[PDB]
Symmetry: C3
Subunit: 338 residues, 3 copies
């Protein structure tokens, strides 16, 4: 019945994004994606703490899917027989059937195929939602990602000017609720099911033990810092499926920010810190003006520095002393100071 | 002195709203409302937990009052002699005297009459505020509601087009702080006064034990699901007098959202999740496009599924397979899969 | 090299602000400021609780710095030898080198001079950020303030009309994490270093023990209430370097609010409650219409009334009975009531 060209997309692991066009003159297509659920123990912090994760495609977050307004998105969701739990998928981008969750519940050993029309532009969360208390548990166990639905003319500033990014990164932020023993040490389990009761008790007190980008403390620091160059316009897509976040690029700004994440609304300009509502994605464009290290954080600095929520950008280029300069290096306070 | 026609309004219990006009050619009126304080033990969760509530008109939230810009609102607040505490009322819609709280403190056995001019359009919180620590306690005990002040021309999209709703619902969200004994069981008390000291200790740690719509977990699910039909534009007014919330309609969107709740500002379009600041009301319009069950949640999914904060809509109509379809029902994974 | 006139500014303690022009016909200048770090024990609540604070210029918050777009800001940061820790400064208004933190780390007995160009309009946080876990600790110990970068034409309403304030106040909100002993009493220490380990444990649970304006519970109440007059337009700058806040003027509104704090964006109009993202500053203009006491709060009322986060305005003038009136004072409920 639906007689449109089909295009298969190969997803890539965050924080990278699969190849796509911004502006397009192609007409609507059926864009075909595959997501495979993987339950596995994962390391989440720099001390080696593990937890029983549940993921789309083996990553936290799940991969970013990119389509254009008016495309149809045909998703095959696979739940391999090595998994222990039923899973499904809910797209905040989609209309009807609890975002697709009501049509995608699959037991281990099954797959399902859902199609949804991309009628709404923006970045949106997708997440597992099997029913009842399983909804938060699967989400906070890692089963969430995002999809971006671009206008066919690409982004704009809300005032009739096109905006084009040179690079895009997807930062998925995850709140984790890891059980502790009586002495405060994190507990380990042999399966997600075995971890559930203790995990739910932590969840109920609404205070995460970890808040991480790309699935673990330090994931996007060191050798996995995000690269850019002076003069490049970088789009940073940020999602949080369960809990608020307040992104901030230390030493930079958000030149154009869609904090609610929807491109039918004009972006705000020149922000210091923006706000991602739990259960949403947002996006910020920034043109780098200075080289060096930048930290990208949630600006609850306790979370950023002590719970895991810091990424780095490493930016190549020449320093601009007009924008900022050290006039006088650290020196002893003059004795003739009052 | 104030020589305007008077109109008595009969309030109704949430989530319904008293009859009113959207656009009106009537001139300003004195709109007369009565609120009666009721202290009573109420069931707040599906396991039968009770707590010592304090309410306007016997409901959590208090009823939605609806007037138009330039009306005067004359409120009789009654504190029956069966109550134990003084009470008052503060309208975030009103100008002066702490929103009216400074002019409305009444002991049991007393009533008071306040008039305020509706100079500011939007949805606004009202709440009790007797003074000092009694302010949070009365609010988190249930003494809060909302008022909507419509433009006389009804709603608009901020771009010169009228917006009209077919149905309106008022969802009041309440954070509750129920004491526990040493084993974790909820405690019961014979009066609000007896509950206070233990309740304040819970309040101080800023983590609710329950987060509910319309006064209890499950209030707006099952047989009390909210009704709508495909094609209807539904206005959902959401308030939270004390704590942030992040509303989301699962399987839908916010077509037009005033998250800060004030109709002098253009709405945002096509949101997935919006944000109600503690101490405010907001509103979202959505035109249903698909039949079925929708869950309306705060998108902290722990709160939604585990603390009580889920409502349902039941939407009648015909399914649109263009917007979404199950291409292939759950099936075994092909053996020839890699 | 940089051949512009230099102007020395003398800062004043919050909530007041140093003298400045709104609109200016002056060209760009090098605006010279000095900040001196002071570590000291400070009283933070009405029961006399102390804590080991770290401050810019002896105050929490640090002073508000005011410049215009295109000015250069040359800041001398001094760390006296009586201090125990290294300190630095990061300006969210500045571009590069982690906002200046990477160029300003000074040991006790040293000073440093940083210059940054004010290319972005708005109110912005500045804070200490020495590295790693020291970042949140220094911030939540008091080392944060704000800077305002005005357009050279002053404020506007986003619709081509100038806005001018008669008075400005800077409200810095601080979340504090004071250790308790086994019985719940707050602990005291002889130095910041000695307090660190216990303080970090509190910080990790993300629940403050105190939330205060201008450095202590009750700071801006009583004889230190903020003054205004009916008819005056008052700008209230609000910052929070670490944690969200939801400001509300009880009995008033935000006539024009920049909740994200950046003057390149049009303000929202007629708000009840607004939202300051942790790691940002915002600003609200209000024209007082009624005399009397107003409370300015974060509208988590537990925080406001029980954790310290209430300020007062005392407004002189004549009451307007058109806006609000007590029609009938408290009286016994008529016996002939049903
Ligand atoms: O012996 C505990 C010690 O070993 C580490 C190794 O990096 O991790 C082990 O214990 C953790 C806490 O139970 C587990 O999460 C992990 O699975 C296990 O290898 C340290 O983290 C831990 O302190
Ligand atoms: O708005 C994007 C997209 O949403 C649809 C529904 O699929 O329209 C919705 O939003 C419109 C514009 O705000 C409303 O007028 C409409 O009533 C509502 O369903 C699409 O038609 C539109 O392209
Ligand atoms: O956090 C409480 C308490 O637990 C201990 C071990 O007894 O440390 C645990 O908690 C730390 C904070 O989350 C982690 O850094 C560490 O991995 C974990 O074992 C104590 O060191 C701490 O006081
Ligand atoms: O890119 C940052 C990196 O560049 C160096 C020189 O290679 O210094 C530049 O950046 C500094 C600010 O971070 C400037 O103060 C300096 O003048 C400029 O040359 C490195 O020192 C720095 O890490
Ligand atoms: O015996 C405790 C058991 O009875 C229930 C009945 O539904 O409720 C009682 O105890 C609760 C906890 O103290 C009270 O809140 C309630 O008022 C009382 O009827 C169960 O909830 C409870 O577990
Ligand atoms: O704005 C709605 C309503 O507020 C009033 C005061 O009651 O005006 C306020 O807002 C105006 C427009 O933003 C400001 O110009 C004014 O100074 C401020 O008092 C009413 O006059 C107006 O209808
Ligand atoms: O929550 C702690 C602990 O308390 C128990 C009873 O000892 O359950 C209580 O708490 C549950 C979570 O809020 C409620 O579902 C129940 O109504 C309440 O009695 C334990 O079951 C739980 O481990
Ligand atoms: O309204 C939802 C309700 O309708 C039924 C048929 O009565 O199925 C419709 O809705 C489904 C999605 O929820 C579609 O997949 C189906 O094709 C459509 O007919 C019920 O199965 C469903 O609960
Ligand atoms: O004896 C404790 C008692 O004295 C007070 C005096 O106002 O403060 C003392 O103890 C506090 C808690 O340790 C300290 O923070 C403070 O430095 C010290 O003077 C009371 O607050 C306290 O309850
Ligand atoms: O926007 C204020 C200020 O920022 C600068 C950079 O210092 O420009 C940024 O914002 C512009 C307008 O949004 C973008 O076009 C530009 O690419 C970005 O660097 C200044 O040029 C401008 O005055
Ligand atoms: O808060 C727990 C518990 O501690 C006590 C003293 O044992 O009070 C402390 O905590 C109160 C709340 O923060 C403070 O008002 C007071 O300054 C502090 O000593 C108990 O009174 C309270 O139950
Ligand atoms: O400014 C508030 C202050 O003024 C007084 C009279 O001096 O009363 C005025 O304000 C009241 C509302 O707060 C009005 O009801 C009254 O009519 C008006 O004269 C004081 O009573 C009040 O504290
Ligand atoms: O599908 N839930 O475990
Ligand atoms: O300025 N960053 O924390
Ligand atoms: O009026 N307060 O309990
Ligand atoms: O998509 N709702 O959780
Ligand atoms: O400089 N840090 O303690
Ligand atoms: O209306 N103020 O809490
Ligand atoms: Cu799942
Ligand atoms: Cu969702
Ligand atoms: Cu009350
Ligand atoms: Cu209020
Ligand atoms: Cu410092
Ligand atoms: Cu910062």
């Amino acid at each position: 019945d639906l007689k449109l060209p089909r295009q298969r997309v190969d997803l890539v692991a965050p924080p990278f994004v699969h190849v796509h066009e911004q502006a397009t003159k192609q007409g609507p297509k059926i864009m075909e994606f595959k997501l495979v659920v993987q339950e596995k123990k994962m390391v989440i912090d720099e001390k080696g703490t593990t937890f029983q994760a549940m993921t789309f495609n083996g990553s936290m977050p799940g991969p970013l899917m990119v389509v254009h307004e008016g495309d149809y998105v045909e998703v095959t969701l696979v739940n391999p027989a090595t998994n222990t739990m039923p899973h499904n998928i809910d797209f905040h981008s989609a209309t009807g059937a609890l975002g697709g969750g009501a049509l995608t519940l699959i037991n281990p050993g099954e797959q399902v195929v859902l199609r949804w029309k991309a009628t709404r532009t923006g970045v949106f969360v997708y997440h597992c939602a099997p029913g009842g208390p399983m909804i938060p548990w699967h989400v906070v166990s890692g089963m969430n990602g995002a999809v971006m639905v671009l206008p066919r003319d690409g982004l704009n500033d809300g005032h009739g000017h096109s905006l084009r990014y040179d690079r895009i990164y997807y930062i998925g932020e995850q709140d984790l609720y890891v059980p502790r023993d009586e002495k405060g040490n994190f507990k380990s389990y042999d399966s997600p099911g075995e971890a559930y009761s203790d995990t739910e008790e932590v969840m109920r007190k609404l205070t995460p033990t970890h808040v991480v980008f790309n699935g673990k403390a330090g994931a996007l620091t060191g050798k996995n810092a995000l690269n850019a160059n002076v003069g490049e316009n970088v789009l940073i897509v940020h999602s949080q499926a369960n809990r608020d976040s307040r992104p901030h690029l230390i030493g930079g700004h958000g030149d154009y920010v869609w904090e609610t994440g929807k491109f039918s609304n004009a972006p705000e300009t020149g922000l210091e810190t923006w706000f991602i509502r739990g259960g949403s994605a947002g996006a910020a464009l920034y043109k780098f003006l200075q080289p060096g290290i930048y930290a990208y954080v949630t600006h609850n600095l306790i979370e950023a520095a002590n719970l895991g929520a810091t990424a780095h950008f490493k930016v190549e280029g020449k320093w601009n002393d007009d924008l900022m300069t050290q006039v006088k290096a650290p020196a002893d306070i003059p004795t003739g100071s009052t």
